[PDB]
Design an enzyme around this catalytic site. Structure first.
Site, PDB file in Angstrom:
ATOM      1  N   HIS A  72       0.804  -1.244   0.000  1.00 33.07           N
ATOM      2  CA  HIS A  72       0.000   0.000   0.000  1.00 33.07           C
ATOM      3  C   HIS A  72       0.871   1.347   0.000  1.00 33.07           C
ATOM      4  CE1 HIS A  72      -3.001  -3.195   1.277  1.00 33.07           C
ATOM      5  NE2 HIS A  72      -3.868  -2.451   0.610  1.00 33.07           N
ATOM      6  N   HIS A 112      -6.843   7.364  -2.241  1.00 32.52           N
ATOM      7  CA  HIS A 112      -7.733   6.309  -1.650  1.00 32.52           C
ATOM      8  C   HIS A 112      -7.143   5.314  -0.612  1.00 32.52           C
ATOM      9  CE1 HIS A 112      -6.218   3.125  -4.150  1.00 32.52           C
ATOM     10  NE2 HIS A 112      -6.937   2.345  -3.341  1.00 32.52           N
TER      11      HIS A 112
END
Ligand SMILES: COc1ccc([C@@H]2CNC(=O)C2)cc1OC1CCCC1
Ligand SMILES: [Mg+2]
Ligand SMILES: [Zn+2]
Length: 323
Positions: A72, A112
């Protein structure tokens, strides 16, 4: 440099290779790609967004993604933003969205997963993280990525929406919150079921283009578009998909290590002593990805046939990798 421009030729394409562009931009995939995306779609011209202001905002944002987190990191945001940028141009969705909805969806993709720590919502809740208490256990990570991303538009040197109408900043802030919250995986089923109902009652024009009533239907397709973009690694070329598999399994197993360090129970797909990377990817395609893209394909047919084919094919590679 020169390898950067050769790679950005594929900008508007599923074959685009996000690693190559990371390597040619001083580890700033997200800024390079977002910047290429806006120019391409003429967004800065459309929403009187200064270029300075835009770079400063992106750079700051990219730098809030943790670079020691295997999956991520800023690369994944860059990926999801580029994937969304292509889906937005799919032929079945032509002239359907406003400029504002288009800017909303790509911006949603970019912010996001910002400030993601490399552990699940479930983990953060069981360890009583500050974040879980802050958010009362509901879309912990997702509410956070949304708050960070919208806080960074507080500076003047970072308010890239300063030249929208008041009504436009609101309509946008609403669409974004709605799309990022939809990337929370525990909402997956509800979203997939909702998508299947929308296909059931799909209506097009004489030229094979969808007919989306008003707000409600438009943002449901955007919800689902960013959620497919987030679960698009297995629809990408095999070479790209396996590098994505390695990074996510890296991140997952670091979580399994921290779980064990602390006497907590280890989630089986995070257990590095018993989980097959291969079985797990097959499962992930059979019960989550294929069901979703199959439904997406029905919605924009036949635009995603190639994507479905690439998917079944990547599926069988991993299947053939298991004894
Ligand atoms: C490339 O694959 C994956 C790509 C993306 C994710 C999202 C980020 N984390 C999630 O839970 C969904 C998981 C993946 O694989 C995991 C499912 C079990 C095997 C690993
Ligand atoms: Mg996320
Ligand atoms: Zn994500």
């Amino acid at each position: 440099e020169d390898h950067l421009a050769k790679e950005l030729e594929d900008l508007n394409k599923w074959g685009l290779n996000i690693f190559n562009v990371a390597g040619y931009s001083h580890n700033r995939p997200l800024t390079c790609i977002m910047y290429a995306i806006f120019q391409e779609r003429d967004l800065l011209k459309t929403f009187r967004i200064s270029s300075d202001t835009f770079i400063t905002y992106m750079m700051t944002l990219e730098d809030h993604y943790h670079s020691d987190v295997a999956y991520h990191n800023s690369l994944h945001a860059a990926d999801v933003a580029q994937s969304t940028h292509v889906l937005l141009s799919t032929p079945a969705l032509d002239a359907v969205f406003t400029d504002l909805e288009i800017l909303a969806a790509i911006f949603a993709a970019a912010i996001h997963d910002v400030d993601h720590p490399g552990v699940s919502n479930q983990f953060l809740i069981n360890t009583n993280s500050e974040l879980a208490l802050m958010y009362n256990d509901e879309s912990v990570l997702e509410n956070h990525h949304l708050a960070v991303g919208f806080k960074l538009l507080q500076e003047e040197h970072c308010d890239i929406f300063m030249n929208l109408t008041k009504k436009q900043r609101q309509t946008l802030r609403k669409m974004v919150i709605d799309m990022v919250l939809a990337t929370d995986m525990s909402k997956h089923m509800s979203l997939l079921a909702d998508l299947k109902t929308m296909v059931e009652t799909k209506k097009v024009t004489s030229s094979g283009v969808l007919l989306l009533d008003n707000y409600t239907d438009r943002i449901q397709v955007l919800r689902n578009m960013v959620h497919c973009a987030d679960l698009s690694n297995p629809t990408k070329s095999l070479e790209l998909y396996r590098q994505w598999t390695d990074r996510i399994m890296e991140e997952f197993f670091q979580q399994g290590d921290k779980e064990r360090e602390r006497g907590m129970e280890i989630s089986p797909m995070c257990d590095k002593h018993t989980a097959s990377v291969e079985k797990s990817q097959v499962g992930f395609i059979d019960y989550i990805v294929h069901p979703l893209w199959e439904t997406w394909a029905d919605l924009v047919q036949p635009d995603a046939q190639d994507i479905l084919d690439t998917l079944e094919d990547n599926r069988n590679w991993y299947q053939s990798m298991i004894p």
